[PDB]
Amino acid sequence: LADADAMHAKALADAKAESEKVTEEAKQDSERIAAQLSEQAGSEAERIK
């Protein structure tokens, strides 16, 4: 029971850390996608010009 309580707390902490890393990578990917699509939009606007 003590081991299970400790491991449950550890699993919740690991889930928090994994969520933090996942959302950081998600923000990074959002920035990457936004940059790529803004570059595409700029290229298309320059082509139209």
Partner: protein, 50 residues
């Protein structure tokens, strides 16, 4: 894309007007040189100076 299309459309019309006029200006010089060009062409076809 919409903004670029709108600005290019505005530029085009601006250019259509400017061209139009630029053409009228030139149309004049055109009518000034028409006489000499026609004389040269007539001389060419006739095979001798008109």
């Amino acid at each position: 894309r919409a903004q670029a299309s709108g600005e290019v459309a505005q530029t085009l019309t601006q250019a259509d007007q400017q061209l139009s006029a630029q053409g009228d200006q030139v149309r004049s010089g055109l009518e000034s040189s028409v006489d000499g060009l026609s004389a040269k062409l007539a001389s060419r076809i006739l095979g001798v100076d008109v």
